Write a protein that binds this ligand. Structure first.
Ligand SMILES: Nc1ncnc2c1ncn2[C@@H]1O[C@H](CSCC[C@H](N)C(=O)O)[C@@H](O)[C@H]1O
Ligand SMILES: [Cl-]
Ligand SMILES: [Cl-]
Ligand SMILES: [Mg+2]
Length: 155
């Protein structure tokens, strides 16, 4: 079970840089919490955003946060389980979940996401799926992968 403890805002900024997020992107944050990843993607980079979040109290907070930030026209939140969500329109995916949850999610990412889609994770890796980047911050790690044209036979 993934607790609500958010990614610090400076770490969020580094995640968005690492994925080269820009105004043409549609960023999906899977387990979106207070909405900070999608809100900062919209405010800083002009990207459209979708946050998927299971807890209705956090969906409510995130919607309020987006309105207060002046980015409600760019950002949408959906109440639901991320393992059941349609994420195929994502051009970038961001994650701060758990090691076991990342492992369960991996095949869904391969099923739904277009080749070339960046995936960025705070702190937790994807097992034998090797990252393209690993950024060491003071007390946090950020990984990036790019969805390949062919899934490695190992995976
Ligand atoms: N199966 C699931 N589907 C959607 N959201 C889930 C989920 N399991 C846990 N969550 C949510 O995932 C969030 C993890 S905290 C991370 C929040 C945000 N992405 C950030 O980085 O700041 C919590 O808000 C929790 O309620
Ligand atoms: Cl919304
Ligand atoms: Cl790079
Ligand atoms: Mg890009």
């Amino acid at each position: 079970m993934v607790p609500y403890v958010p990614t610090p805002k400076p770490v969020v900024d580094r995640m968005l840089e690492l994925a080269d997020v820009d105004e043409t992107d549609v960023l999906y944050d899977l387990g979106s919490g207070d909405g900070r990843i999608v809100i900062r993607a919209a405010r800083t980079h002009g990207a459209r955003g979708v946050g998927i979040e299971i807890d209705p109290d956090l969906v409510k907070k995130a919607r309020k946060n987006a309105k207060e930030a002046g980015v409600a026209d760019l950002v949408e939140f959906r109440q639901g389980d991320l393992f059941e969500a349609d994420i195929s329109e994502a051009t970038v995916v961001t994650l701060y979940l758990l090691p076991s949850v990342n492992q369960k999610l991996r095949p869904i990412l391969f099923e739904q996401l277009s080749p070339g889609t960046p995936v960025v994770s705070h702190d937790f890796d994807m097992g034998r799926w090797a990252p393209d980047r690993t950024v060491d911050l003071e007390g946090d790690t950020v990984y990036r992968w790019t969805i390949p044209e062919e899934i490695p036979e190992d995976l």
